[model samples]
Target: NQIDLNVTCRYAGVFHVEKNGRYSISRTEAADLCQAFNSTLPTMDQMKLALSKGFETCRYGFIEGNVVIPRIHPNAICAANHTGVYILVTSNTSHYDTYCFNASAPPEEDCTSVTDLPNSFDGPVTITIVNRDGTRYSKKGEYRTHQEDI
Candidate 1:
């Protein structure tokens, strides 16, 4: 069984360092994340929208699946497994709106369980951000699987 994880953001935000060198969100970081997404920082108006939409940190997982299988969400249009999944990270906003897989084939439903990848290989796979949608953007690509043992 093989699985892959990929993450994409419309924009990049601030970075905060902790004593342990691990990072978390700071006020500036939060603002920067928002700005990267083309949204205003924590402002009264933004707060109002957040409150209305129940907005908090943007860690919501719209969808998840094996790299080669297709799992669709109303919010997203997924390629067949391993192909890749497209995420609508932010909707009805300006900044950092969309992120997509850099290298993925269409998703297929015939994926084996995650336990199938060979132990000698790396676990669950991950794809890169091949394309993106900024303020006004759109693109698409081919679908195929890259085999890797666990």
Candidate 2:
């Protein structure tokens, strides 16, 4: 099994971990660290354990009551060779939109897409959004995918 973890923050935050029985600040300076450890994806329980240990040894409450911890859910892992498709819509009317669909699920529909209204978009033109389950939340329109690019 393979897992990929991606972390993001709306604002900058600090992280610390124990090193040689002593706390070391600035363990990671990045605003968001993707898959800090490549061994395996940290399960929610494992994440809690790691977080607890860091808090105990660092003597700092960096993530205490300020961040929203999400609950991990069951998801399927797609094969490495599987190439996920992305659709990009471009228009000259000063408006554009993008959408995604679950290629594996039954009768897959639009998952999620980007939209720019009243703005001129000129660039490389490939918009890549992470999909953890290949399904976008109906109301929230959030994109998710279980496929990982090895």
Candidate 3:
């Protein structure tokens, strides 16, 4: 399977593709956008993994930790002429895509019914769940992260 597809499919149609022919978004702006969508900026390592797993492009985007990363190849579109790599982008620049990362757990990782929980525990722990449309459920003190498409 295409690794990017695994990562991209979850947030498909959620990312914005600016049509103004420029993409120089600031780190703060990019961060807010990702957070609005319940996602986050990718990391250098994540971008590197994406390159190995079939992520190819020339668009630059804000990655995790104040680093702007882009997919580059030895082509005109490639920001870096290094061929198939992730390049840290220029903050002063004013043109690049915003690559946001979102994590949607697989079916097997879905939160099972409470029946699966123990009859009793040494204190207690809270578990929460969310549906695809934003419906939520919680029991026991913590926030539920994985959104269940129930």
- TM-score to true structure, per model: 0.21, 0.16, 0.48
* Candidate 1, residue 86: how far the Cα is off, in Å: 33
Most accurate candidate by TM-score: 3
RMSD of 3: 13.1
Each candidate's lDDT (Cα)?
A: 0.23, 0.21, 0.42
Worst 10 residues of 1 by lDDT: 11-20
lDDT of 2 at 57: 17
Candidate 3 local lDDT, residue 107:
19
TM-score of 1: 0.21
Q: What digit string (tens of lDDT, one per residue) describes model 2 on residues 1-150?
A: 211121121111112222122222121211111112112222333335433332111122123211112222222331112222111233233211111111222222222332211121233322232233432211111111122311
List all candidate RMSDs to the true structure: 18.4, 20.6, 13.1
For model 1, the local distance difference test gives: 0.23
Candidate 2 versus truth, CA RMSD in Å, comes to 20.6
Per-residue lDDT, model 2, residue 67, is 17
After superposition, candidate 1 runs with Cα above 4 Å error: 1-23, 53-150
True-vs-predicted CA distance for residue 42, candidate 3, Å: 0.7
Off by over 4 Å in 2: 1-37, 56-150
